[PDB]
């Protein structure tokens, strides 16, 4: 027997690499930093071990979604002049949207440096902090200056495909019962992933991909209460947003070529912004979640859903973006039930204009007012739960870390490095 060298053997090792974007009005995650797309090959008898919790695509996608966010905010207005003293009065002076607003008057710079401009705007009470018609100031003014969300770029997520470079392959687990870890009997080599919409949300995985046959529970260590549980639905739960107000965006020229878009007036339906989830559909979806959740804790255990414990408004609420305006919904009527072995649910949502999105300090963003009435149709395709540390297990909604949102889309994918040079014995002998 003699050593014979084979070049091109189908052998791969696990690897971490830089996957390039691909996609098929500018966007935050635009197509100017991506590549046009064009595929899937079934690898029979191949049983690969996946790990959705130590996947580097999740860590890289988090970096890239952040990077495309900042890259899309540099070329537009920085609101340094908006740190002035505000003389704010109430809008209603008495349940409505107008009880959430302060009518703030301030001196603003003009396009001519030596001239001022007495202007006013309606600021949400969540954006103004009192100084001790009282005197207020914008909330993120002692920490940073808010680069205005540029009005011509949309926040709508477009699907992005992460494609492996040459010498690498993306393995896709086609198993329908694959939780997040261990062998996957059915594997495929895709050129690159399905369109992953970077939907940014907390406590609820809006839009995205459904499970195939049954609700899937995915935790790094189900016995550890410090690990989030990524529930994935099989049938989506439709959630409808609204801001009933007919907003009136107003433009203020704060400098040469720079405009500040302000809420000048609010008329129309002044009901508080809310989201509606069907009460029958949500009840049967939690029934499926509970059924798949007793498999890890016992048949006789009591599964109780409570509401978020505490913390920032971005972590205690179903924070999300819808129609360019950022909502923060309570979701305390969604998660309120105890499970023993036409109607709708209305979630009161607050709205903010000053956004510190990626759990960072020092880089805020001022989301300008959206003219008109905002309406919203989304699919709740998952959950992020945390368990409380007795025969009763309490599951509060979780979140905060944006990586668990994209870990729910990149759980089935894996990047490998092709090792095409292999040696093996054969009856050969070089002449």
């Amino acid at each position: 027997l003699w050593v014979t060298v084979y070049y091109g053997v189908p052998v791969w090792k696990d690897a971490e690499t830089t996957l390039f974007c691909a996609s098929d009005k500018h966007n935050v995650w635009a197509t100017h930093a991506c590549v046009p797309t064009d595929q899937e090959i079934h690898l029979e008898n191949v049983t690969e071990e996946f790990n959705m919790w130590k996947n580097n695509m999740v860590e890289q996608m988090h970096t890239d979604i952040i990077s495309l966010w900042d890259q899309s905010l540099k070329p537009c207005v920085k609101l340094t002049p908006l740190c002035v003293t505000l003389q704010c009065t109430n809008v209603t002076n008495n349940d409505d949207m107008r009880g959430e607003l302060k009518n703030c008057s301030f001196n603003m710079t003009t396009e001519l440096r030596d001239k001022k401009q007495k202007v006013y705007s309606l600021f949400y009470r969540l954006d103004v902090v009192q100084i001790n018609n009282k005197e207020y100031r914008l909330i993120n003014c002692n920490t940073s200056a808010i680069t205005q969300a540029c009005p011509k770029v949309s926040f709508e997520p477009i699907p992005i495909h992460y494609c492996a470079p040459a010498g690498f392959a993306i393995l896709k687990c086609k198993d329908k019962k694959f939780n997040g870890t261990g062998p996957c009997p059915s594997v495929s080599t895709v050129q690159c992933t399905h369109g992953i919409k970077p939907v940014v949300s907390t406590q609820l995985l809006l839009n995205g991909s459904l499970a195939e046959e049954e609700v899937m529970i995915r935790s790094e260590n189900i016995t550890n209460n410090a690990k989030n549980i990524l529930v994935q639905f099989n049938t989506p739960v439709q959630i409808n947003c609204t801001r009933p107000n007919n907003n009136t965006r107003k433009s203020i020229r704060i400098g040469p070529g720079q405009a500040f878009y302000a809420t000048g007036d609010i008329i129309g339906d002044i009901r508080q912004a809310h989201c509606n989830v069907s009460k029958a559909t949500w009840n049967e979806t939690l029934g499926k979640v509970v059924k798949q959740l007793r498999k890890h804790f016992g048949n006789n255990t009591i599964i109780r859903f409570a509401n978020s414990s505490g913390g920032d408004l971005e972590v205690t609420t179903h924070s999300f973006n819808c129609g360019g305006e950022f909502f923060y919904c309570n979701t305390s009527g969604l998660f309120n039930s105890t499970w023993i072995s036409n109607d709708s649910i209305t979630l009161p949502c607050r709205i903010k204009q000053i956004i510190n999105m990626w759990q960072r300090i020092g880089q805020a963003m001022y989301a300008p007012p959206i003219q008109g009435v905002i309406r919203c149709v989304s699919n709740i395709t998952g959950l992020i739960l945390t368990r409380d540390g007795s025969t009763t297990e309490t599951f509060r909604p979780g979140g905060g870390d944006m990586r668990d949102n994209w870990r729910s889309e990149l759980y089935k994918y894996k990047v490998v490095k092709i090792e095409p040079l292999g040696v093996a014995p054969t009856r050969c002998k070089r002449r």
Binding site: W2, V5, Y6, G8, A166, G167, I418, R430
Partner: protein, 122 residues
């Protein structure tokens, strides 16, 4: 026709008839990252083609050589290697003997270069 890596689970004898399929696929924020992925593909390909040329296997996919197979590397017979094992299984067995085999092929050709250099001198 199986496709790229189609014979990964096939036996070594059967997977050696599809070497061209894998060979032709080793060569061909979204800027320099995509550009340095192409340069890495060329460098990885060129250092594999350099090894073949050093061993006298340039321009060939199956290159029978002169280095005898040390039984220490693998005591299996030909029947149970080319008809019972796949290339991924085989690579695992001899992953540690790869570098000593590579040196043996490198020096054997270097001896053949001077042997044919002296024969042509007559």
């Amino acid at each position: 026709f199986l496709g790229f890596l189609g014979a990964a689970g096939s036996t070594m004898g059967a997977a050696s008839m599809t070497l061209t399929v894998q060979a032709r696929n080793l060569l061909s924020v979204w800027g320099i990252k995509q550009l340095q992925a192409r340069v890495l593909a060329v460098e990885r390909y060129l250092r594999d083609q350099q090894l073949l040329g050093i061993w006298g296997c340039s321009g060939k996919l199956i290159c029978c050589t002169n280095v005898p197979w040390n039984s220490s590397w693998s005591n299996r017979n030909l029947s149970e290697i080319w008809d019972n094992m796949t290339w991924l299984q085989w690579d695992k067995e001899i992953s540690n003997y790869t570098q000593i085999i590579y040196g043996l092929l490198e020096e054997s050709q270097n001896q053949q270069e001077k042997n044919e250099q002296d024969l042509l001198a007559l």
